Amino acid sequence: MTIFDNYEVWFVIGSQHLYGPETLRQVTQHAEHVVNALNTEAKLPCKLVLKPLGTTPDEITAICRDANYDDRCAGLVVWLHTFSPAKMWINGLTMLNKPLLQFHTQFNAALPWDSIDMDFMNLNQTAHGGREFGFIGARMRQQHAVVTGHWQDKQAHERIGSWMRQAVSKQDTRHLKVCRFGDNMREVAVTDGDKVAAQIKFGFSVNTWAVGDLVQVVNSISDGDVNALVDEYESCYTMTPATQIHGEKRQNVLEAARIELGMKRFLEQGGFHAFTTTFEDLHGLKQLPGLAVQRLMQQGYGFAGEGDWKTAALLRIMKVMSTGLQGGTSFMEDYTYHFEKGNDLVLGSHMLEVCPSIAVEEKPILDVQHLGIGGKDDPARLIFNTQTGPAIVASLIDLGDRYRLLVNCIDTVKTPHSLPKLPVANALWKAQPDLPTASEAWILAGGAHHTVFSHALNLNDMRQFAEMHDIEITVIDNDTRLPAFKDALRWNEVYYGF
Amino acid sequence: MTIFDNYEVWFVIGSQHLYGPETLRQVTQHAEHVVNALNTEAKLPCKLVLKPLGTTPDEITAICRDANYDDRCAGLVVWLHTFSPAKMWINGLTMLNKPLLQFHTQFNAALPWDSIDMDFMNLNQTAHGGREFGFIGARMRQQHAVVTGHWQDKQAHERIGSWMRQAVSKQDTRHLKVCRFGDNMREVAVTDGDKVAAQIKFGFSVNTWAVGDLVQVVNSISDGDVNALVDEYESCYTMTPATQIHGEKRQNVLEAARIELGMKRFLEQGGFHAFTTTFEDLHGLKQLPGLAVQRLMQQGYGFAGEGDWKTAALLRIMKVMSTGLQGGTSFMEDYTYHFEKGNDLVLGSHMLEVCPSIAVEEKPILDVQHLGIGGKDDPARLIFNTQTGPAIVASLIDLGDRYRLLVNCIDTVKTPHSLPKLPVANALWKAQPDLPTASEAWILAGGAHHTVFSHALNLNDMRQFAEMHDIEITVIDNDTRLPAFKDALRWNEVYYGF
Amino acid sequence: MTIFDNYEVWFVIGSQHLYGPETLRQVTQHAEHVVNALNTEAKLPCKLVLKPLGTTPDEITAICRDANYDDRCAGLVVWLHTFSPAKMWINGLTMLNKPLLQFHTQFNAALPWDSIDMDFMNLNQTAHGGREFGFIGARMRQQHAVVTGHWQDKQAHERIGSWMRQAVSKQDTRHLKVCRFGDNMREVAVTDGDKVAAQIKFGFSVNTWAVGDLVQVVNSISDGDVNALVDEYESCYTMTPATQIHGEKRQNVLEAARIELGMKRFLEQGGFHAFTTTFEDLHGLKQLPGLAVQRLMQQGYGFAGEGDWKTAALLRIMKVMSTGLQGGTSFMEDYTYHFEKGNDLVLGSHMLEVCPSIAVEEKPILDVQHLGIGGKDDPARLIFNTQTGPAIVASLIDLGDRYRLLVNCIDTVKTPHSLPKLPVANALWKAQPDLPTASEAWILAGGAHHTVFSHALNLNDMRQFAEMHDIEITVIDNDTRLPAFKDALRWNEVYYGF
Ligand SMILES: OC[C@@H](O)[C@@H](O)[C@@H](O)CO
Ligand SMILES: OC[C@@H](O)[C@@H](O)[C@@H](O)CO
Ligand SMILES: OC[C@@H](O)[C@@H](O)[C@@H](O)CO
Ligand SMILES: OC[C@@H](O)[C@@H](O)[C@@H](O)CO
Ligand SMILES: [Mn+2]
Ligand SMILES: [Mn+2]
Ligand SMILES: [Mn+2]
């Protein structure tokens, strides 16, 4: 059971009652056959539910009405099997608050040249029926996705499935709750913003609980539960000598477990899906949460450092978005560079909190070392290298009047040498198209230092994400050239500045 | 003594070389005479400094250059004694970061009918010289204030002085720092916003320090200093029996003094000018700051409850703005109503924090009692009635893309019966034009529940404030009618929403 | 020697206090090392001055305050060595009137894989520090240039230096003064415009002096000075028989020298940097200034014919811009075409005034002949061919509501046959991508017939010029295709037409 089992997409057939109380039977039989075949074979993210034929205005209005009400309904995929006059859809589409995709398909794939007749033409007419429907969407300026192809086409399945994924993500995000432990790092701009605007736009909520509230729960955790979690550490991780029994930093490990159990309890009891910390407010805590945050991230929680709620929310969103796909997704920060002709690399990390979902090593190292920042005890953390392959780094920024999604396509590479003195985990990558252009484009477009790294999700996923939420996507990849990149920033500014 | 002594306004004379240098000698003489007479007699908020004549482009550019550099320079008041071709001012006005007012005046009041000749016409030509200058301001869309009248006109003095007041306020606000003790009350919208946008727009800064940081300073205060402050309470205030030496709530008074001294020390050492608290985060504190906050407000600090930084900043701004005026400016909240035909009243207060600067009684009551909200010890507070007369309540709200200043003209009235069971101070007023229309207009325009109350400042002061900062002012007063009020909201929306 | 020695660029280091003051000691050491190495080796247009570290809000505000005041300060190049919270920069950046470039660099080139630790990570973090700064620029919509690369990278030096060039040009242009001798040619549109708008936008001034004023100065010049200048003509130029001592046009040469000396004196005494003439107003002059204008242009003065102040100003700007580059920038006009398959050429000239800075021959011809236009004596001029190689032609036009910079990349070629009957100098070129498309794109975009020709400057220089001044650049080159060219015109129209 995943989150995707809590949702469904409605397969709605468009037609007319003009028509034949057979002829509609025939269309219904096609729809049932198609929907069943897709549910069984297509391997889509969630289940398609065939609804009664939309043949009259009140029927179509009813379906849209029901669609809005049903919390499991993540969207509609519409097949206009016959001509289905678009005025019939207006009242329904006007009220519809769930996303919609037209599957511009057909029954048959080969054209029956020798048998095709008016009867066939009067029943199988998606060719024009789908265009009349396309008009009303474009006329109303509604965000209607469209996928053309035969219903057995596996390329079409992929694209439909990809859209269904975004549909689910949009619903989930409307219930996403962020818990902040303290405010933003002082004097920082990018991590700030308008929480009210975010909730209006995306539907996720951001509210702060005092660090003291958390401390109370952490201090209530039993010694038995703390010891039990430490046993799970030793089975999961490669424990350094200082971390072992009789180690000089053994107590720092127990306390790390205490913080993890307290945070987890607090999060679960509050029904939270993501959270933030701030090293400038850790009163009552023995150490900056490190290990705790990493395992919580791995368990699916969203997170970002120094009160960065936008990225924390984004992490959760993308983690949920990537369900059932191969690869990890993590909080990330651009730490330092390697300048070398033809091999410019970016080293990515954070103070402590890097998610092991992107780790290569079956067993990360668990270590305790000094962290000056925050002025607390030596915190426990997981140290590891990042897996190799294509990835993206994404940043959602608040431009004051609107949001911008920056997405840089990257390629993670293996470290050319060990990092024996680096007490934190690392990601290492080549930024497309190259480091100077990638960094400059990002800086020109105002992208944050905090990002969401992912192997699981790609540029196409984020394009659809940005469309779904009607925000600017700023793309930085192999095709990026600065002059054209700047033109687009300007032309988008006047478009989205409406 | 005051902050106004830390600023000056530059009196700049506009002219040219067409008829000089004995004509220019005459202009300089007029300027010195005028400026001296104004500084001595006019009673303006701060000092006027006469600068060298602006007669060439490089001279005028130099003056503007110097004006930007001098931190004491709050603005320019320009007298165009002769014709002063406006292109000479362009390069200077383009770089100028300080506000500007044209004093459209004349040396002589009466026109010398029997002696007037070309020499006089060449020397005293503000009539047209001031209009050529007006064009360049309007052409560049710069916010140029203008006041017309003879330089000895006391009505003109008032208006010039009123502008100088706003000039000073604008500079001061650029160094205004807000210290938040904890975040916003959870789930609240109007008190939230974009701190980055605020600092870009107004120049004031808002950053959060952990309640724990404050607690450390409060816990460090000497017992001797605590006792000394309690002695000043007894001399200043009417102490209730429970508050006296052998009182059952005597210890709650000492702790209130402890919190005040700790907050004051923290504020002073950080160079802060305003602050906020939140009852949802009081870990380490014995009680919600009440008495402390009230005396700090009286001493000139800005404040608002539940992390409301906009109103806290606004309070400080308006407190500083009202320097030398017959006083009384306070944090305020609309608590409850009195519905009665011909006598609809609004009772204003806050859980604890009402500023005694607006008090009528020379000696407020200093009581201690139960406050459930926050779940802390019974906090000390000052109880008092509010003075009678014309006042305003002001609210600055963040509309997401821009700011709106709401200002409701009111009239405070004496309570028709005492409030013996109300453990907090009170303000009681009639809202112009009437309660239903005043409340509705406010609600329609999204005004906060938190406001800044003032006897000292009026609608005209706030109009100039809103002009100075280029924000919408939404006026609610005796002349307010809802249809026209709504029209203005719409027409301003498209204007300020460029 | 040069104007670039009258300016400097401030190298400002961004940091904070989170880990200091030995970390800050290290940053200061890097900055001093870097700045010294750049000043000595990098060969930048002007000197870099290292300023004290920007670590607090008031420090950064102070630097920006000082930057605006210092007339030698042409701009800031900012290196965010460590994380430097962007709200600290807001108050400073809001007041800043000088251009800014982020040098997104790093002290080390190679990443020390075997030694890298938290200390190194805390000290060398431009990777993220530069992105938090990028946000605030993008958020405020300020024109912040960005260059990424290692500080010893010579490609990065070039780009930084190229930006510094534009920085200097922007300051210089704010003091640029144009002297017009008479008004525009009657009935002409493109050479007209709004001088007030130009001065507001670019800072250069345009004012008209009567031809009579000039005539008075030309008539005052000594016979001795006239003869001395004629001696320098004979040493500099190849004198045609008619131009020699007993030549029939010898007296026309003396008068040409008289006009040159008078114009030069008038220009120098007025502090002018560019000028215009009009053949429709030459009362009191013996001939249309030709030779005089050509040598004045060579000596660095801006010029354009028939009262064309925009191009005259542009010539000066680009001449100053090209200081220290392999030279040749001139006033130019498209005179006639050569239509031939695979060899379409444009012949460029003007009635008299072509700058010998672009000449190939070390000694131009100095002839005298008949010019009907203007109806004056036969004027002296320099005749020469133009050098071979890549060039640009640039035109700044006033669209009424805004400015457009047209830039056509060209390639000058050697004349395939001599021009024995052409009494003026010539430039001959191939217009990219071809003549029909180049001419059509230019005409569609409203480009003037008057242009500034340059070998010294290229498309990249002008792109940065247009960014610096926030105007549309319309590019016509090998990559130009009309459909896409038209799309860009439309999309830019709505952007720049806010
Ligand atoms: O320069 C002064 C000017 O010439 C006279 O005041 C004019 O009358 C103004 O139009
Ligand atoms: O939760 C209630 C709220 O905290 C109080 O009513 C405040 O006085 C509102 O500002
Ligand atoms: O103030 C420094 C800051 O705390 C660190 O560099 C963070 O990692 C930036 O997000
Ligand atoms: O009247 C014609 C015109 O004056 C000449 O052709 C110029 O060379 C055009 O710039
Ligand atoms: Mn971080
Ligand atoms: Mn309140
Ligand atoms: Mn011409």
mmCIF file of N, CA, C and O in Angstrom, chain B residues 454-483:
data_model
loop_
_atom_site.group_PDB
_atom_site.id
_atom_site.type_symbol
_atom_site.label_atom_id
_atom_site.label_comp_id
_atom_site.label_asym_id
_atom_site.label_seq_id
_atom_site.Cartn_x
_atom_site.Cartn_y
_atom_site.Cartn_z
ATOM 1 N N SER B 454 -3.784 56.402 17.727
ATOM 2 C CA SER B 454 -3.074 57.656 18.018
ATOM 3 C C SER B 454 -3.970 58.887 18.171
ATOM 4 O O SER B 454 -4.845 59.140 17.344
ATOM 5 N N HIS B 455 -3.726 59.639 19.246
ATOM 6 C CA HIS B 455 -4.283 60.983 19.429
ATOM 7 C C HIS B 455 -3.418 62.017 18.771
ATOM 8 O O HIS B 455 -3.894 63.082 18.380
ATOM 9 N N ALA B 456 -2.122 61.724 18.694
ATOM 10 C CA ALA B 456 -1.118 62.697 18.266
ATOM 11 C C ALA B 456 -1.170 62.951 16.772
ATOM 12 O O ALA B 456 -1.032 64.088 16.328
ATOM 13 N N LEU B 457 -1.364 61.882 16.006
ATOM 14 C CA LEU B 457 -1.329 61.947 14.545
ATOM 15 C C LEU B 457 -2.733 61.934 13.961
ATOM 16 O O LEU B 457 -3.660 61.392 14.562
ATOM 17 N N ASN B 458 -2.876 62.530 12.781
ATOM 18 C CA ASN B 458 -4.174 62.632 12.108
ATOM 19 C C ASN B 458 -4.138 62.103 10.669
ATOM 20 O O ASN B 458 -3.099 61.660 10.183
ATOM 21 N N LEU B 459 -5.287 62.159 10.002
ATOM 22 C CA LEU B 459 -5.451 61.626 8.649
ATOM 23 C C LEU B 459 -4.481 62.258 7.645
ATOM 24 O O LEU B 459 -3.921 61.562 6.800
ATOM 25 N N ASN B 460 -4.287 63.569 7.750
ATOM 26 C CA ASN B 460 -3.369 64.297 6.870
ATOM 27 C C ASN B 460 -1.921 63.815 7.001
ATOM 28 O O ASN B 460 -1.193 63.745 6.010
ATOM 29 N N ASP B 461 -1.514 63.484 8.224
ATOM 30 C CA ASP B 461 -0.165 62.965 8.477
ATOM 31 C C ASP B 461 0.042 61.628 7.770
ATOM 32 O O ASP B 461 1.103 61.365 7.196
ATOM 33 N N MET B 462 -0.992 60.796 7.811
ATOM 34 C CA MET B 462 -0.936 59.451 7.238
ATOM 35 C C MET B 462 -1.062 59.477 5.737
ATOM 36 O O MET B 462 -0.489 58.628 5.053
ATOM 37 N N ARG B 463 -1.829 60.423 5.208
ATOM 38 C CA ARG B 463 -1.885 60.636 3.754
ATOM 39 C C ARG B 463 -0.490 60.915 3.201
ATOM 40 O O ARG B 463 -0.080 60.336 2.194
ATOM 41 N N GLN B 464 0.233 61.811 3.865
ATOM 42 C CA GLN B 464 1.596 62.156 3.454
ATOM 43 C C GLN B 464 2.565 60.989 3.637
ATOM 44 O O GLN B 464 3.484 60.805 2.841
ATOM 45 N N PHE B 465 2.348 60.211 4.693
ATOM 46 C CA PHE B 465 3.113 58.984 4.927
ATOM 47 C C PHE B 465 2.965 58.022 3.751
ATOM 48 O O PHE B 465 3.950 57.505 3.236
ATOM 49 N N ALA B 466 1.722 57.795 3.340
ATOM 50 C CA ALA B 466 1.412 56.885 2.238
ATOM 51 C C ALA B 466 1.960 57.376 0.898
ATOM 52 O O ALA B 466 2.370 56.570 0.062
ATOM 53 N N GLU B 467 1.950 58.691 0.690
ATOM 54 C CA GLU B 467 2.547 59.294 -0.513
ATOM 55 C C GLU B 467 4.061 59.097 -0.516
ATOM 56 O O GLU B 467 4.644 58.683 -1.519
ATOM 57 N N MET B 468 4.679 59.395 0.621
ATOM 58 C CA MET B 468 6.132 59.284 0.793
ATOM 59 C C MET B 468 6.632 57.909 0.444
ATOM 60 O O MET B 468 7.694 57.763 -0.156
ATOM 61 N N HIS B 469 5.865 56.887 0.813
ATOM 62 C CA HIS B 469 6.247 55.492 0.561
ATOM 63 C C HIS B 469 5.589 54.892 -0.648
ATOM 64 O O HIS B 469 5.816 53.725 -0.960
ATOM 65 N N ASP B 470 4.777 55.685 -1.339
ATOM 66 C CA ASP B 470 4.092 55.257 -2.562
ATOM 67 C C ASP B 470 3.255 53.992 -2.341
ATOM 68 O O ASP B 470 3.408 52.997 -3.053
ATOM 69 N N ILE B 471 2.377 54.042 -1.343
ATOM 70 C CA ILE B 471 1.423 52.961 -1.085
ATOM 71 C C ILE B 471 0.001 53.505 -1.080
ATOM 72 O O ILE B 471 -0.219 54.694 -0.853
ATOM 73 N N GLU B 472 -0.958 52.622 -1.325
ATOM 74 C CA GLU B 472 -2.364 52.980 -1.252
ATOM 75 C C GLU B 472 -2.744 53.336 0.185
ATOM 76 O O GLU B 472 -2.411 52.605 1.123
ATOM 77 N N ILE B 473 -3.427 54.467 0.344
ATOM 78 C CA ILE B 473 -4.084 54.799 1.604
ATOM 79 C C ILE B 473 -5.585 54.597 1.422
ATOM 80 O O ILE B 473 -6.183 55.125 0.482
ATOM 81 N N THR B 474 -6.170 53.796 2.304
ATOM 82 C CA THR B 474 -7.605 53.531 2.290
ATOM 83 C C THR B 474 -8.232 54.275 3.454
ATOM 84 O O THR B 474 -8.001 53.935 4.618
ATOM 85 N N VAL B 475 -9.011 55.304 3.129
ATOM 86 C CA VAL B 475 -9.530 56.231 4.129
ATOM 87 C C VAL B 475 -10.959 55.885 4.514
ATOM 88 O O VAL B 475 -11.816 55.711 3.647
ATOM 89 N N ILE B 476 -11.198 55.796 5.823
ATOM 90 C CA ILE B 476 -12.532 55.550 6.371
ATOM 91 C C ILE B 476 -12.871 56.653 7.380
ATOM 92 O O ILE B 476 -12.303 56.705 8.469
ATOM 93 N N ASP B 477 -13.784 57.544 6.999
ATOM 94 C CA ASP B 477 -14.134 58.697 7.830
ATOM 95 C C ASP B 477 -15.563 59.186 7.560
ATOM 96 O O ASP B 477 -16.316 58.541 6.828
ATOM 97 N N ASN B 478 -15.924 60.327 8.147
ATOM 98 C CA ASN B 478 -17.266 60.912 7.980
ATOM 99 C C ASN B 478 -17.755 61.028 6.534
ATOM 100 O O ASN B 478 -18.949 60.924 6.279
ATOM 101 N N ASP B 479 -16.833 61.239 5.596
ATOM 102 C CA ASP B 479 -17.181 61.385 4.173
ATOM 103 C C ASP B 479 -17.324 60.044 3.433
ATOM 104 O O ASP B 479 -17.703 60.016 2.261
ATOM 105 N N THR B 480 -17.028 58.940 4.113
ATOM 106 C CA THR B 480 -17.015 57.618 3.477
ATOM 107 C C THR B 480 -18.409 57.104 3.121
ATOM 108 O O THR B 480 -19.279 56.998 3.982
ATOM 109 N N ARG B 481 -18.594 56.789 1.842
ATOM 110 C CA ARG B 481 -19.774 56.085 1.344
ATOM 111 C C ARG B 481 -19.326 54.824 0.596
ATOM 112 O O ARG B 481 -18.409 54.877 -0.226
ATOM 113 N N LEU B 482 -19.985 53.702 0.875
ATOM 114 C CA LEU B 482 -19.521 52.386 0.410
ATOM 115 C C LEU B 482 -19.396 52.235 -1.115
ATOM 116 O O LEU B 482 -18.397 51.706 -1.595
ATOM 117 N N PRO B 483 -20.400 52.684 -1.885
ATOM 118 C CA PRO B 483 -20.270 52.577 -3.344
ATOM 119 C C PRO B 483 -18.994 53.230 -3.889
ATOM 120 O O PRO B 483 -18.230 52.590 -4.620
#
